[PDB]
Each structure stands twice: as structure tokens, then as C-alpha cells.
Write a protein that binds this ligand. Structure first.
Ligand SMILES: CN(C)C1=CCC2=C(c3ccc(N4C(=O)C=CC4=O)cc3C(=O)O)c3ccc(N(C)C)cc3OC2=C1
Ligand SMILES: Nc1ncnc2c1ncn2[C@@H]1O[C@H](COP(=O)(O)OP(=O)(O)NP(=O)(O)O)[C@@H](O)[C@H]1O
Ligand SMILES: [Ca+2]
Ligand SMILES: [Ca+2]
Ligand SMILES: [Ca+2]
Ligand SMILES: [Ca+2]
Length: 354
């Protein structure tokens, strides 16, 4: 049985090809004395320096990444890597040298029998059942617009916004102080992330939503805290994710996700634009907000030609679309020759991965 490992800036998603969802999901964090991995590392902040080996989707520290992979195989999945072909995912615009190092580590450190590396955005597109379209992938640390034509991600048109879930959680923590609530500790941040994932949503029209929240309490929702106290949240529910469309909310000069989507499409050949407009696919935990698809549909329509057919696809399981795409691909045993085997690695070296 093949294994699928999707390493993100904030979370590692791992499992067996064929499963409908990852069996293991843990924080992409490594702790080193002043080593531990995941929840275990976070728990020991202070006595351990924390390291996030994956920044903006790109691996930046190989020794820490090695620890993460070891943890995935031996502690989380509890499998013998030498017995399973392994599919790994990589961020858009990942340097070739990185792909080579990843391959060298899998064969020489973990001794896998075979492996394959796929681009995350492409896997998310496959998860929606298509090979052409533009993916909006927003996770914990980075957001990308990735146009894909017949399985090929067009590098020159990929857009990147260094704003994601982590920043949204921090922002919600900040604005919740306005109502007098104070969330500051690590434990408190965990509560805020839960509030964000349960009560936040994207307004179809921000200004009108603010007006509705100010003229009524129809948008207010209550939330019980660990101590038994109950708080009320109003416009904070939609102000938090609005940051995706208005990065200036958290002090970023970058254009919003709707604008980057449009700019991405305009960087592509005019003859395939129609296909991208009709196939806008959302992927990643930060695209889970109710209302985001309707908002993107409205914003893109405003930017696109009047006779352009616009369609946004937001799969219910998009929180794990990347992993799911990998599960699908890795489970196609008929194409087993696509796997890069150890033997092929011996004769051709790391460069065979490209
Ligand atoms: C199991 N495993 C590991 C695997 C890998 C891969 C694959 C692929 C392919 C094939 C080819 C290519 N390519 C490109 O792209 C370039 C060159 C080549 O070859 C790509 C691809 C993906 O990824 O999808 C594919 C395609 C198509 C299909 N169909 C059914 C129709 C399937 C598959 O499967 C697979 C599997
Ligand atoms: N229902 C939800 N509503 C809002 N945010 C959510 C929800 N579920 C998960 N998230 C956020 O999504 C992020 C996790 O998404 P994920 O796609 O796994 O990112 P990643 O792969 O770790 N990192 P990245 O490198 O940025 O793609 C966290 O910031 C979560 O809080
Ligand atoms: Ca990701
Ligand atoms: Ca600034
Ligand atoms: Ca042309
Ligand atoms: Ca092969």
C-alpha cells in the first residue's frame, strides 16, 4: 500500500493511498533543546527552541524536515517506510534542488522502495476531478493562485500572498480585545482558532454586512469558553476572513485574493483564460469559510469581461484536497511505472526526480 505525505507550513497530513482522508495530522514543528516533534514540541516551549522547517510551503531546514518525516513514519503512522512506495507533495515554484534533496533523503535515509513528487495545487485540482483550471490554495502560512493547463502548472502566472490561517488567527485574537475579551496565551490562542473555524464567515458584501451588524443583532453568535464563561461575537465573524480580500487589515500592502486570481489569469494565454474562469478551484484549510465561494464569484465577475462564464468550485473536503489528490494518484497501480524506483535512482541519481 502506497503512502501519501503532504507537508504544509503549519500541518503535516499523512496516510495511506486509498483512504478518503489523512489518518495523521499534526503540527509541522520541531523542538530543539536550548529533539521533539509536533504537539510534543509545542508543549515544551521555553525549554526548547521551536522551528518551523517549512516556510511559505518551502522546506528551509533539512535536518528538521528529516525529523518530521521520521515522526510521520515511526510515531504517527507507525509504518515501515522501506515497505511502502511514498508520494510527497511540494509547493508551487519549488526549486529543483529541493526536489532532489527530498528524493535523496527518502531513498538514503528512509530507504523507501519507490517515490513520487507532485505539485500540491495540481493534486487539489485532481481532487476536484479536472486537469485544467486555476487553484486558490490557502493554508496556514501562505496563499497561492496557481493556473494549471492539462496537468501543467504555469510558473510565470503563479501568484503568492504571504498571508494565511496563522495570520487570521492572530488577527481575530487582536480584534476580540475590542469587546474587552483578552486572549493572549498559547492556550488562549487555541480557543481563538476554534472560534475562527466555527463562527467566522466571508461576507458577500463587507460594507453592507457591517451595516447589518450595526443595525441589528441578527449576526451575533455566542461561544462558551473553557472556564464556563460565554462571549458574544458580531462583526468579528466576518472581519477576520475579510483580510483575505483586504490585506491592509493586518498591515499588508498586497492585493486581495480576488485581485491575485484575476492577475494570475491575465498572465495566461488569452486562449485558455475561458477555461480558467470556468474552473476556479478552492483548496486549503483557509478556504473553508462559509461564503467564500460566493464572494469570489462576485469579485471575479466584477473584474472579468461581461460575457465570461465564471464558476467557483469549493469541494466540501477541500481542507484536505491536496492530500486527497495524492491519495487518488498514488492508488492508480496501473500506472505503477510512474513511480521512481530505488533501482532507477541508483543508475540515474537524484536528477531522475525531475
Ligand atoms: C501511481 N503514481 C505514482 C502515478 C504517478 C503519475 C500519474 C500520472 C502522470 C503521467 C505523466 C505525467 N507527466 C507529466 O506531467 C510530464 C511528464 C510526464 O510523464 C504526470 C502524471 C501526473 O502526475 O498526474 C497519470 C496521468 C493520467 C492518468 N489517467 C488515468 C488518465 C493516470 C495517471 O496516474 C499516475 C499515477
Ligand atoms: N473550518 C475552518 N475554517 C477556517 N480555517 C480553517 C478551518 N479548518 C482549518 N483551518 C485553517 O487552515 C490552516 C490549515 O490548513 P492547511 O491547508 O493544512 O495548511 P498547511 O498545509 O499546513 N500550510 P500552507 O503551507 O500555508 O499551505 C490553519 O491556519 C487552520 O486554522
Ligand atoms: Ca498546503
Ligand atoms: Ca505594512
Ligand atoms: Ca494564443
Ligand atoms: Ca519508473
Amino acid at each position: 500500500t502506497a503512502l501519501v505525505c503532504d507537508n504544509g507550513s503549519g500541518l503535516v497530513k499523512a496516510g495511506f493511498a486509498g483512504d478518503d482522508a489523512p489518518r495523521a495530522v499534526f503540527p509541522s514543528i520541531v523542538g530543539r533543546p536550548r529533539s521533539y516533534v509536533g504537539d510534543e514540541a509545542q508543549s515544551k516551549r521555553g525549554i526548547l527552541t521551536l522551528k518551523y522547517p517549512i516556510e511559505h510551503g518551502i522546506i528551509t531546514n533539512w535536518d528538521d524536515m528529516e525529523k518530521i518525516w521520521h515522526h510521520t513514519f515511526y510515531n504517527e503512522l507507525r509504518v515501515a517506510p522501506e515497505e511502502h512506495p511514498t508520494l510527497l507533495t511540494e509547493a508551487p515554484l519549488n526549486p529543483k534542488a529541493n526536489r532532489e534533496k527530498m528524493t535523496q533523503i527518502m531513498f538514503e535515509t528512509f530507504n523507501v522502495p519507490a517515490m513520487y513528487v507532485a505539485i500540491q495545487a495540481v493534486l487539489s485540482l485532481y481532487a476536484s476531478g479536472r486537469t485544467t483550471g486555476i487553484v486558490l490554495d490557502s493554508g496556514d502560512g501562505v496563499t497561492h493562485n496557481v493556473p494549471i493547463y492539462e496537468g501543467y502548472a504555469l510558473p510565470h502566472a503563479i501568484m503568492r500572498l504571504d498571508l494565511a490561517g496563522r495570520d487570521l488567527t492572530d488577527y481575530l485574537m487582536k480584534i476580540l480585545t475590542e469587546r474587552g475579551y483578552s486572549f493572549v496565551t498559547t492556550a488562549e490562542r487555541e480557543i481563538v482558532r476554534d472560534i475562527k473555524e466555527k463562527l467566522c464567515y466571508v461576507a458577500l458584501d463587507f460594507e453592507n454586512e457591517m451595516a447589518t451588524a450595526a443595525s441589528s443583532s441578527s449576526l451575533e453568535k455566542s461561544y462558551e469558553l473553557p472556564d464556563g464563561q460565554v462571549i458574544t461575537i458580531g462583526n468579528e465573524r466576518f472581519r477576520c476572513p475579510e483580510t483575505l480580500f483586504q490585506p491592509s487589515f493586518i498591515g499588508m500592502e498586497s492585493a486581495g485574493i480576488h485581485e491575485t486570481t484575476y492577475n494570475s489569469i491575465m498572465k495566461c494565454d488569452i486562449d485558455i483564460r475561458k477555461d480558467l474562469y470556468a474552473n476556479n478551484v478552492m483548496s486549503g484549510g483557509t478556504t473553508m469559510y462559509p461564503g467564500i465561494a460566493d464572494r469570489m464569484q462576485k469579485e471575479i465577475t466584477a473584474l472579468a469581461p461581461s460575457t465570461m462564464k465564471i464558476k467557483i468550485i469549493a469541494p466540501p473536503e477541500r481542507k484536505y484536497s491536496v492530500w486527497i489528490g495524492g491519495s487518488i494518484l498514488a492508488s492508480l497501480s496501473t500506472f505503477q511505472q510512474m513511480w521512481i524506483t530505488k533501482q532507477e535512482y541508483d543508475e540515474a541519481g537524484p536528477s531522475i526526480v525531475h
